[PDB]
Ligand binder design. Structure first.
Ligand SMILES: [Mg+2]
Ligand SMILES: [Mg+2]
Ligand SMILES: [Zn+2]
Lengths: 204, 175, 52, 163, 198, 190
RNA sequence: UAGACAGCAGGACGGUGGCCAUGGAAGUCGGAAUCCGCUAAGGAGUGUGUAACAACUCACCUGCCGAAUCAACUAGCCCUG
């Protein structure tokens, strides 16, 4: 029922997402977009390693799930059941049409078989959050994953702190000074403009 | 950009004034190229990446050739680079021997076409330094740091072949 | 049946070897790359299975 | 204890080794030492009063950390009970033989060490308390005619007194 | 690793050789470390006993600070397998000690036969597995009701041989090795005065 | 890259005399003479000392591979000197389970006949390379000896036997019958 | 140059079956796990056959030759595919 993925790899047609105009499509094969101890505060898992793309193409929901599982298995077997938190940073919003020739070429407009995701260069596909003694295991995990995708990808470490957007060298000083607050799996920046009652509540 | 035998040019430049600002800052650069018509153009290429200017919004104050100071003293040069391959973009460091800074740079652009096959439009040159006999990290150049050095000229091929084209003496390749 | 020292000497040349998984070859027991061009010096080896 | 110096529930059972002798490093400078209020002279004075015969025999160690007077009963020396019925006394200054009398003569210490264990490391009617107290016949001994590795397939006593 | 282990030895062995004058060096022959291991039960840290590495080729750094003489006079004496055994104590006593302070001395083969060999007039062990071991050499093998009792007194081995597989497996397996020695006394460090152990 | 020079040396004892017509070495000593050519390597050979004490081989301006040859020349020469001064001796042993093997020597030291390998009726014949002499041994039953001055011919000769004596269409991990080399060595222990 | 890196030569004990699992796991499809020391160092032990072994073996130092070397990435010509 499913075709190969060389038939649908390139970003040819315009987006044709799921809405009131396109009806009659199934769901996707992936439904979970993050795993591991997904509750940890910002301080436990400071290291982040990413997977990055290098092509303008299309990736399928099946590929994402397979990659998700291969990484989890090894990462468990290496570090632990709770030594990490993993997140997927893509969503399959674009749809694929199929014309089945069981007339010929008359009345050609397909049926919504599939879902797929688009990629630009520099985008991110996968990311892991863990500790610094487990660096090489993180690299090994992602390397097993690239063999599930159609293209050329590459891996890099980030200078940031975890899944935040602040440089590590600055973060640690900057939390001991009441500009950054650890509100969950993330932080919350606050400037010097609001009303002072929030400056009264803090500093007390 | 193509290449012949290269030359070094000193180009220094400025933006254009306006009722806001009266005397903007000057900016200097050191550039290697065939002639002065292209060097002016490479200048606007770099200064645009760094700062926010253009050719219509600026002027060239001086462009001139800088001459070698000691062209009869052998020297060791070190070169820092940025180029980009078919996959990504890379940095590197390379070392050479020559008498003139121009000639060493020229000697690079050939070498890169040969090892890594990079055309000149894919190369950026940052810095060049006259390095001592020490501080040379590369062995091909350290072979020659010898006070008592020598070697022969082993197997030496006949040039000048088509002067006599049909002969009787088979040659000699020992001298 | 057979003296052990002679038996060891025979096993040297007929039981103590490594095997490329691709080309199904014989290699000296301290190897890491194949010798043949049919496989490309492939780096994928196993040891030879001793009798039970 | 977390918020401040509140000694409410701290009695703990830790593990140390290197043997219970007076030493040069003294074997009484662990990482758990400086947590427990122990100065260096008294913490050895209690250990050497506690290590009186029954038992002077080197075991790895064990320590049920209390505040001041910390008792240390004989641990589960099970490879070392092969030898820890050595003809006493042997404390210091007279130890030219490492453990070489070879006079344990297993007749009673097999089953007596087997029962002496506090139902420790076994899911069996003392079968494992025989096994792991026999796991260390490296430098062991046996009856004057019996040698290890060719006697270990026989049992000739009654299992009625096991626990 | 080798980071904190040797970071000690940046100055530790330097410190040992400077502040504490007199010493000995023990040469290690083809030996297993049982002697270096269970030398603990021969002595204690009356001074210290510690065999290390061949850092005794690093002596320009040691005479850099002008610590003590008789230090540099060892480079030929250390080509490989030697240690260092430190005692600041009575000379002739420790001389007599490490003349023959080598108890365990286990090794299957390779070593020397130091003394003359004698009649084996004892019971080393009987084996009913096979008698070809005795029939090959051809000596009296009188069988008197199962057991075998030898009475012949004759010479078999003499000093200055090279050990073979036959007597090697003999001296491993039958619980007799008058064959190996552990670690011997050979030098004198009298803080600067060099003389022999006579 | 390229490098300006690489060189390596070999000594000679007093008993031996060697000479060279360029890249053609002549060795002579007690056990005769040897002659070998190296006209396919492009090196400079020289010989210096009182009565030509020592030899050096050197090369100028070579790649990674071309430098690899310089030690290989030297290794061969050490072998030739040793052979003409001492001579090579390799020992070989036979192995069997039920059917033993009967080897005999027809010429003085040239032709070998192997008979009853695995209970066959076929006969295997082998011809030694010229210069080599074979002879059965003593103090151990199933043993051969090969003396020669040229290691090449010896090793080539011994291996012909080892391959001629081999079994087919079976599991060799069990059937381990054949003539297998025991140990290399020398005619003289010095 | 404090002598590593390749190779030759003495190895891989105790509280300890840590502890799930016993249909089998005193390392033994294998999973949360993975403290302590004896030395000079033996890992709650690396595939092997496995009632289970004892142990084979996969870090750790005692010597020979010996030093400028080692590892992981990356891209150009050539090669397998
Ligand atoms: Mg279209
Ligand atoms: Mg299964
Ligand atoms: Zn192959």
């Amino acid at each position: 029922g499913r075709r190969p993925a060389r038939c649908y790899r390139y970003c040819k047609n315009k987006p044709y997402p799921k809405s009131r105009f396109c009806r009659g499509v199934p769901d996707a094969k992936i439904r979970i977009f993050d795993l591991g101890r997904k509750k940890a505060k910002v301080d436990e898992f400071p290291l982040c390693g990413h997977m990055v793309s290098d092509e303008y193409e299309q990736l399928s929901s099946e590929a994402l799930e397979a990659a998700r599982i291969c990484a989890n298995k090894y990462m468990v077997k290496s570090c632990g059941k709770d030594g990490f938190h993993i997140r997927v940073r893509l969503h399959p919003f674009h749809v694929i049409r199929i014309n089945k020739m069981l007339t010929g070429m008359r009345g050609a407009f397909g049926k919504p078989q599939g879902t797929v995701a688009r990629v630009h260069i520099g985008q991110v596909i996968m990311s892991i959050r863990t500790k610094l003694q487990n660096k090489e295991h993180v690299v090994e995990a992602l390397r097993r994953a690239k063999f599930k995708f159609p293209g050329r990808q590459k891996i890099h470490i980030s200078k940031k702190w975890g899944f935040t957007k602040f440089n590590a060298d600055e973060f640690e000083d900057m939390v001991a000074e009441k500009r950054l607050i650890p509100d969950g799996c993330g932080v919350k920046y606050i400037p010097n403009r609001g009303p002072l009652d929030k400056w009264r509540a803090l500093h007390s | 950009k193509a290449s012949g035998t290269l030359r070094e040019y000193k180009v220094v430049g400025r933006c254009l004034p306006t009722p806001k600002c009266r005397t903007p800052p000057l900016y200097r650069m050191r550039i290697f190229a065939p002639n002065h018509v292209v060097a002016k153009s490479r200048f606007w290429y770099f200064v645009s990446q760094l700062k926010k200017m253009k050719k219509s919004s600026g002027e060239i104050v001086y462009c001139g050739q800088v001459f070698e100071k000691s062209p009869l003293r052998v020297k060791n040069f070190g070169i820092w680079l940025r180029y980009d391959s078919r996959s990504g973009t890379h940095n590197m460091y390379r070392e050479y021997r020559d008498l003139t800074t121009a000639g060493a740079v020229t000697q690079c652009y050939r070498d890169m076409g040969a090892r890594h096959r990079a055309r000149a439009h894919s190369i950026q040159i940052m810095k060049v330094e006259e390095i001592a006999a020490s501080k040379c990290r590369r062995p091909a150049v350290k072979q020659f740091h010898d006070s008592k050095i020598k070697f022969p000229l082993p197997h030496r091929v006949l040039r000048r072949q088509h002067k006599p084209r049909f002969t009787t003496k088979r040659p000699n390749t020992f001298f | 049946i057979i003296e052990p020292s002679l038996r060891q000497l025979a096993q040297k040349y007929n039981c103590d070897k490594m095997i490329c998984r691709k080309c199904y070859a014989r290699l000296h027991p301290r190897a890491v790359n194949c010798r043949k061009k049919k496989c490309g010096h492939t780096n994928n080896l196993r040891p030879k299975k001793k009798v039970k | 204890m977390p918020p401040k110096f509140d000694p409410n529930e701290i009695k703990v059972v830790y593990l140390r080794c290197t043997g219970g002798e007076v030493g040069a490093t003294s074997a009484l400078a662990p990482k758990i030492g400086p947590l427990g209020l122990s100065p260096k002279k008294v913490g050895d004075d209690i250990a050497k009063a506690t290590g009186d015969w029954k038992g002077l025999r080197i075991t790895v160690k064990l320590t049920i950390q209390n505040r001041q007077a910390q008792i240390e009963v004989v641990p589960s020396a099970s490879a070392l009970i092969i030898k820890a019925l050595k003809e006493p006394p042997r404390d210091r200054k007279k130890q030219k033989n490492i453990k070489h009398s070879g006079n344990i003569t297993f007749d009673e210490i097999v089953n007596i060490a087997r029962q002496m264990r506090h139902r420790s490391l076994a899911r069996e009617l003392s079968g494992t308390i025989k096994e792991i107290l026999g796991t260390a016949q490296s430098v062991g001994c046996n009856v004057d005619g019996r040698h290890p590795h060719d006697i270990i397939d026989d049992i000739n006593s009654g299992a009625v007194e096991c626990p | 690793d080798r980071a904190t282990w040797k970071s000690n030895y940046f100055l530790k062995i330097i410190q040992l050789l400077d502040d504490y004058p007199k010493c000995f060096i023990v040469g290690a022959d083809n030996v297993g470390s049982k002697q270096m291991q269970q030398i603990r039960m021969s002595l204690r840290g009356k001074a210290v006993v510690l065999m290390g590495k061949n850092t005794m080729m690093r002596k320009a750094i040691r005479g850099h600070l002008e610590n003590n003489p008789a230090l540099e006079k060892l480079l030929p004496h250390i080509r490989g397998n030697v240690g260092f055994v430190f005692t600041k104590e009575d000379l002739t006593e420790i001389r007599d000690m490490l003349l023959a302070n080598k108890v365990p001395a286990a090794a299957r083969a390779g070593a020397i036969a130091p003394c003359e060999v004698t009649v084996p007039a004892q019971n080393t062990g009987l084996g009913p597995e096979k008698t070809s071991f005795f029939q090959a050499l051809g000596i009296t093998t009188k069988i008197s009701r199962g057991t075998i009792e030898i009475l012949s007194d004759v010479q078999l081995i003499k000093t200055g041989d090279k050990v073979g597989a036959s007597e090697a497996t003999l001296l491993n397996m039958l619980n007799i090795s008058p064959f190996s020695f552990g670690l011997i006394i050979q030098q004198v460090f009298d803080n600067g005065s060099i003389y022999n152990p006579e | 890259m390229k490098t300006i020079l690489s060189n390596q040396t070999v000594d000679i004892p007093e008993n031996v005399d060697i000479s060279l017509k360029g890249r053609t070495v002549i060795v002579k000593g007690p056990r005769g003479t040897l002659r070998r050519d190296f006209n396919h390597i492009n090196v400079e050979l020289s010989l210096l000392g009182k009565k030509k004490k020592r030899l050096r081989v050197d090369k100028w301006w070579g790649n990674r591979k071309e430098l690899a040859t310089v030690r290989t020349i030297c290794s061969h020469v050490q072998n030739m000197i040793k052979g003409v001064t001492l001579g090579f001796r390799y020992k070989m042993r036979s192995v069997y389970a039920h059917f033993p093997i009967n080897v005999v020597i027809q010429e003085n030291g040239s032709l070998v006949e192997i008979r009853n390998f695995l209970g066959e009726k076929y006969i295997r014949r082998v011809r030694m390379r010229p210069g080599v002499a074979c002879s059965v041994s003593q103090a151990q039953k199933d043993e051969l000896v090969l003396e020669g001055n040229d290691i090449e011919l010896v090793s080539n000769s011994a291996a012909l036997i080892q391959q001629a004596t081999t079994v087919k269409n079976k599991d060799i991990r069990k059937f381990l019958d054949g003539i297998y080399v025991s140990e290399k060595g020398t005619v003289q222990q010095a």
